[PDB]
């Protein structure tokens, strides 16, 4: 997506560590963040709001 491309362009090292916590979709990320499996979700402002 666009968020991954922006992360790669800005902070490649952060992207390298973040690749191991990728999610299949938005709802899976939400249910993972509700539990302790995840701490922060990075995604576009409108959908997150």
């Amino acid at each position: 997506g666009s968020t991954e491309r922006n992360i790669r362009n800005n902070y490649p090292y952060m992207h390298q560590y973040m690749t191991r916590f990728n999610q299949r979709g938005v709802e899976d990320a939400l249910v993972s963040l509700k539990t302790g499996k995840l701490d922060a979700f990075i995604y576009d402002a409108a959908v997150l709001n």
Partner: protein, 49 residues
């Protein structure tokens, strides 16, 4: 070097326009022709309270 998805359909003349949650960035605007942004978006971090 091949675009896939909504941008992929637009590039290869398979679709005149691509309405949807399409973020505007440098590479896409270089490859396709965007319109005026009608809603504010951007990277954001969403976490448990």
């Amino acid at each position: 070097n091949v675009w896939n998805g909504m941008i992929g359909e637009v590039v290869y003349q398979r679709a005149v326009m691509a309405v949807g949650s399409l973020t505007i960035n440098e590479e896409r605007s270089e490859v396709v022709d965007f319109s005026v942004p009608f809603v504010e978006t951007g990277i954001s971090v969403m976490v448990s309270r």
